[PDB]
Design an enzyme around this catalytic site. Structure first.
Site, mmCIF file in Angstrom:
data_model
loop_
_atom_site.group_PDB
_atom_site.id
_atom_site.type_symbol
_atom_site.label_atom_id
_atom_site.label_comp_id
_atom_site.label_asym_id
_atom_site.label_seq_id
_atom_site.Cartn_x
_atom_site.Cartn_y
_atom_site.Cartn_z
ATOM 1 N N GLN A 126 38.643 40.285 51.101
ATOM 2 C CA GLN A 126 37.566 40.546 50.147
ATOM 3 C C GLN A 126 36.233 40.044 50.672
ATOM 4 O OE1 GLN A 126 37.359 42.181 46.723
ATOM 5 N NE2 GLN A 126 35.387 42.113 47.787
ATOM 6 N N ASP A 148 33.116 34.590 40.293
ATOM 7 C CA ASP A 148 34.513 34.983 40.254
ATOM 8 C C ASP A 148 35.064 34.431 38.950
ATOM 9 O OD1 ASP A 148 36.949 36.113 41.082
ATOM 10 O OD2 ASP A 148 37.357 34.483 42.527
ATOM 11 N N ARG A 189 50.633 39.078 50.592
ATOM 12 C CA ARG A 189 50.011 38.330 49.507
ATOM 13 C C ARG A 189 50.991 37.220 49.131
ATOM 14 N NH1 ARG A 189 48.286 35.197 46.031
ATOM 15 N NH2 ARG A 189 47.583 35.760 43.930
ATOM 16 N N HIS A 224 40.694 34.372 50.420
ATOM 17 C CA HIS A 224 40.675 35.830 50.123
ATOM 18 C C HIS A 224 39.844 36.447 51.247
ATOM 19 C CE1 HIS A 224 41.377 39.406 47.981
ATOM 20 N NE2 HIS A 224 40.915 39.090 46.782
ATOM 21 N N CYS A 265 34.245 39.653 43.044
ATOM 22 C CA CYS A 265 35.599 40.173 43.230
ATOM 23 C C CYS A 265 36.186 40.606 41.886
ATOM 24 C CB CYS A 265 36.478 39.082 43.869
ATOM 25 S SG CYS A 265 38.119 39.664 44.409
ATOM 26 N N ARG A 312 36.527 47.194 50.103
ATOM 27 C CA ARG A 312 37.846 46.665 50.428
ATOM 28 C C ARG A 312 38.628 47.649 51.274
ATOM 29 N NH1 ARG A 312 39.943 42.836 46.468
ATOM 30 N NH2 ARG A 312 42.063 43.121 47.303
HETATM 31 O O1 LIG Z 1 39.585 49.028 39.054
HETATM 32 B B1 LIG Z 1 39.161 48.102 39.928
HETATM 33 O O2 LIG Z 1 38.738 46.928 39.450
HETATM 34 C C1 LIG Z 1 39.557 48.226 41.450
HETATM 35 C C2 LIG Z 1 39.155 47.253 42.352
HETATM 36 C C3 LIG Z 1 39.509 47.360 43.691
HETATM 37 CL CL1 LIG Z 1 39.035 46.148 44.896
HETATM 38 C C4 LIG Z 1 40.251 48.426 44.133
HETATM 39 C C5 LIG Z 1 40.654 49.383 43.222
HETATM 40 CL CL2 LIG Z 1 41.621 50.730 43.834
HETATM 41 C C6 LIG Z 1 40.318 49.299 41.881
#
Ligand SMILES: [O][B](=O)C1=[C]C(Cl)=[C]C(Cl)=[C]1
Ligand SMILES: [O][B](=O)C1=[C]C(Cl)=[C]C(Cl)=[C]1
Ligand SMILES: [O][B](=O)C1=[C]C(Cl)=[C]C(Cl)=[C]1
Ligand SMILES: [O][B](=O)C1=[C]C(Cl)=[C]C(Cl)=[C]1
Ligand SMILES: [O][B](=O)C1=[C]C(Cl)=[C]C(Cl)=[C]1
Ligand SMILES: [O][B](=O)C1=[C]C(Cl)=[C]C(Cl)=[C]1
Lengths: 308, 298, 307
Positions: free
Chosen positions: C131, C224, C101, C128, C264, C292
Site C-alpha cells: 500500500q 488510517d 497476508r 503494509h 488506505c 494498488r
Molecule cells: O472498495 B474499495 O475500498 C477497494 C479498495 C481497494 Cl485498495 C481495492 C479494491 Cl478492488 C476496492
C-alpha cells in the site's frame, strides 16, 4: 456515451432486446469469437447471497470474452457495511469494466448504477431475474422460431422474480404473457403496469388469473418456478396449499398446444411446482434453458460494453 | 466412450502406461497441450475441501488452456438443492470434465453413471488414484522401468493410499506389499481386485504385520498419515532402521502432509532417499496427463 | 540471489525508484509485461482474509499472464498440518512467487528464509509495504518528484501504515512526521531503521503529539483507521486519544495550499477523516486505491526479474 445498465428486463427496448438475443445465438455458435475483455480486463461478480449456478455461468462466460471475473462472495464484510455503496462503486469503476451483482432490494442496484461509471448487471435480485429470462427467450427462439405472437403462461407464485421478469421481458419480445397465481400472490402492481405499457408497444398482452386450466389452454410455453425462496421460508405462510392447483404436471401440460415446451429456473423441487414426468419428458427445455444462461449473459455483456 | 477415472483399476496396464508417458512429456513441456483452450471449463467439486488437490488441478487446468470452476464443500454437498442427476446433466453442458472430491464411492459411482463428460476421483475415502499416478511418475523418473520393482506401504493398510498403491502398483507391474497391524488391514474387495490384475502383469500382493520383512529388499518404501489411539502403528514407523534394510538406492514416498516424528522421521524425510517433494510436484503433471487422456477419448 | 519484499526498506532507494517507475509504466500499458505467461502460478495466501488485497493481486497477476491460486483463511491455517518449511518447499515447485497476508513478521521471515521464490508481504500487523508503494506512486503523479516532500501521518502511530510510511517514505527521500498520542508511538526498532535509512536519502523522521505542528507546511496528509480488528478487544478507549488527530478541514487548511490527502481504505467517515476532506479536491484516496493494482504488478515484475 451514456453508461447502460441492465437491472430489470425493460431496461432493453424491444429492438435492443432483439439485438442481444441475436448476439446470444451467434455466441452460442462461436463462443470465443468476441473478446472485448481481452487483457484480461476485470469484471466484478459480487454476491450478497451466494449462487453457485450464477457464479459458474458468469465466471466461465467472462473468461470466454477474454476477461477475468473477480468473484466477491457473501462472506466478505457485505457491500454497504465497512464502506458506503458509493465508495465501492467508485473504486470498482477503476478496477473492472463491468459490475455483476446478486443482491436483494432493487434500490441497492439503482444506487450502484447511479454512481458506477461502468455497466451494472442484475445477476439475480428479489424483484427480477433478467438474465434468466434472456436465456428463456433464447431457448424459446431455438425451439419455436419467432417469439412475436407466442403465448406463454407462468404458474405458481406470481410475485417472485421470475414472474416479474417473464412479464417484462416476455412482452418486450412480443409474447402474450399470462401469470396464473392464487390470490395474495399476484404480481407487484408497478411491474404489472410497466409490462402492460410495454406490451402496448409490441402488440403483446398481460393476463393475470387464478384459473390454471384456463392459463394452460392454448399455451406455447409453460413456465413455473419454486413456490418459496430462501427468504420466504420464515414468512409465516402455508406456501404449499395455495399453490397445489398450479402444479405443472402432465395433466396441465396436456391442456396446452400439442407442441408446447416447458421452462423452469433451476433448481426445481420435483413433486411440488413440477412433476418428474414433465421435467424429464420431451416437452422440457429446462436443460437447454440452463445452458443458455452462459450464452445470453455473454451477449448482454458484449452489448453493454460496446454501448458504454 | 465416456471414460471415468474413479479407481486406479479403472485404467488397464496399457492405458496407465499411456498416462504416465504423457505425464513425463507434460513435465518437460508444461503448456504444449491445450485441449481446453477457450477457455473451456472444468468443474472441480469438493464435498470436503482439499487445498492440495485444488491447487494442483486449478493450475493444471489453466496450463491446459482452460478455466477451473471450483465449487467448495459449502456449495456442493452434491445433492444440496437438487438431485445429483439434475446437477450432472447441467454440468455436462458447461464443462468438459468433472473433478470431484467426495467421501463414499457410491456417490462417485452415481455421478459417473449419468454424466456425459469424464468424471475424475480427485481423492475419496477409499481411493487416491491421482496421487498414485504422481507416485508412479516419481518412481519412474528415479528408477527407470516400473515393472519388477518391489514397493512396500507401511502403516494404515485400510486407508485410500494403501488401496490405490495396491491397484495402481500391480497395474504397473510392481510387487506391492502392505505392512499394517491387524486392526487396520486392506479392504477384502480391493485386495482380491488387486490380486486379479497382478495375475495379468506378473506382480503380486502381500499383507503382513512384519515390517522388517516388508522393508527387506524393497525398492520403494511408502507411508501415509495414521489419522492413545495411535499405538498399533508405531512398529511401522518409516525410520532410518527400516530404510537400512531396503535395496540400495531405494526411494521413500509419502502423500503429504507428513506428521514428522510419528509415521516418518526427519532423518528419512530430509535424507537422500526421500522423493516426497518431487512426488508432491508431480500431482500437477500426472493430473494434467490424466485430463488430457480422458478428454481426447471422451 | 532470491529477493523478497517483507518490509518497505527491503528495497534500496535506487531499487524503490525502479519499482515506482515500473508502476507508472504498467499503469499506462497494463498487459505488455507477461513474465508469468503460461500461466505460471502465484500463491496468494491469507491467514486472515482481505478482499481488497485479494482483488488487486488476483487481477494484477492475471494481467502479467499468470494465475493466482488464492488460499483463504478457511483453508487449514499455514503451519497447522505441516511446517512452514515443508509448505515453502512444495510451493517453490508450484508457483513463481508467494504473496502472503499474515500477522507476525517472524512468520514472513521464516518463509522467505526457506522459499526459493520471492516472498511478498501483502499486508501484516507490522507493515503494509504494497500500500505504501501505491501511496508513493500516487504522490508522484500528483506532486512530481518525491525527494524533499513533507508527509505527515495522523492517528495510531504504531499500526502497519505508520511503520511503512516511515520506512518507505524516507527511502523515497520524503520528510516523514508521525503525529500520534502518547502510548501509540511507532515501534522503536522501526523508527531507528527509518532514521538510519533517512541518513542516506536526506530525509528525516519526526514523531510528535502536536497535530497542528505536524500539519503546518505538510505536502501530504495521511491517516488510517484508529483500530484494527485485532485491537477491538484490547481494552483501550481507542477514540478519545485520537480525536485531536482527526484529518478535518481545519487541519488540512494548515498544510501547504496544494497538499494532498491519502487514506488506505476502508475509511470510517466521521472518525479519523471527515466527508469534506475525503470528497474534496485534495483527496487522492481513489487513485491511491487504484494504484494498488499497478504498484503490486510492478513489484512482482521487478522481483521476478531479479530472482
Ligand atoms: O472498495 B474499495 O475500498 C477497494 C479498495 C481497494 Cl485498495 C481495492 C479494491 Cl478492488 C476496492
Ligand atoms: O446447486 B448445486 O447442487 C450445484 C452443484 C454443483 Cl457441483 C454445481 C452447481 Cl452450478 C450447482
Ligand atoms: O494445508 B496447508 O498447510 C496448505 C497451505 C498452503 Cl498455502 C497450500 C497448500 Cl496446497 C496447503
Ligand atoms: O442446476 B444446475 O446444476 C445448473 C448449473 C449451472 Cl453451471 C448453471 C445453471 Cl443455470 C444450472
Ligand atoms: O470491503 B468491501 O465492502 C468490498 C466490496 C467489494 Cl464488491 C470489493 C472489495 Cl475489493 C471490497
Ligand atoms: O503439502 B504441501 O504443502 C502441498 C502443496 C501443494 Cl500446492 C500440493 C501438494 Cl500435493 C502438497
Amino acid at each position: 456515451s451514456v453508461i447502460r445498465h441492465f437491472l430489470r428486463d425493460d431496461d432493453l427496448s424491444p429492438a435492443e432486446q432483439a439485438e442481444v438475443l441475436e448476439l446470444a445465438a451467434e455466441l452460442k455458435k462461436d463462443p470465443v469469437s468476441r473478446r472485448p475483455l481481452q487483457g484480461p480486463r476485470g469484471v466484478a461478480v459480487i454476491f450478497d447471497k451466494n449462487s453457485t449456478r450464477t457464479r459458474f455461468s458468469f465466471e466461465l462466460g467472462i473468461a470466454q470474452l477474454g476477461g477475468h471475473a473477480v468473484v466477491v462472495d457473501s462472506g466478505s464484510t457485505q457491500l454497504g457495511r465497512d464502506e458506503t455503496l458509493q465508495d465501492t462503486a467508485k473504486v470498482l469503476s477503476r478496477y473492472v469494466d463491468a459490475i455483476v451483482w446478486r443482491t436483494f432490494g432493487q434500490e441497492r442496484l439503482d444506487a450502484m448504477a447511479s454512481v458506477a461509471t461502468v455497466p451494472v448487471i442484475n445477476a439475480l435480485s428479489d424483484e427480477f431475474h433478467p438474465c434468466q429470462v434472456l436465456a428463456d427467450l433464447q431457448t424459446i427462439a431455438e425451439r419455436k422460431g419467432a417469439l412475436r405472437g407466442l403465448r406463454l403462461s407462468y404458474f405458481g407464485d406470481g410475485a417472485n422474480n421470475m414472474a416479474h421478469s417473464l412479464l417484462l421481458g416476455g412482452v418486450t419480445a412480443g409474447i402474450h404473457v399470462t401469470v396464473a397465481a392464487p390470490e395474495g400472490f399476484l404480481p407487484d402492481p408497478s411491474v404489472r403496469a410497466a409490462a402492460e405499457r410495454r406490451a402496448q408497444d409490441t402488440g403483446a398482452s398481460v393476463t393475470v388469473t387464478a384459473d390454471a386450466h384456463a392459463a394452460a389452454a392454448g399455451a406455447d410455453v409453460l413456465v413455473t418456478d419454486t413456490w418459496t425462496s430462501m427468504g420466504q421460508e420464515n414468512d409465516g405462510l402455508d406456501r404449499v396449499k395455495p399453490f397445489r392447483p398450479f402444479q405443472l404436471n402432465s395433466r396441465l401440460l396436456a391442456l396446452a398446444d400439442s407442441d408446447a415446451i416447458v421452462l423452469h429456473c433451476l433448481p426445481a423441487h420435483r413433486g411440488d411446482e413440477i412433476t418428474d414426468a414433465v421435467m424429464d419428458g420431451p416437452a422440457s427445455a429446462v436443460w437447454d434453458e440452463a445452458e443458455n444462461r452462459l450464452h445470453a449473459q455473454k451477449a448482454l455483456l458484449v452489448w453493454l460494453l460496446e454501448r458504454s
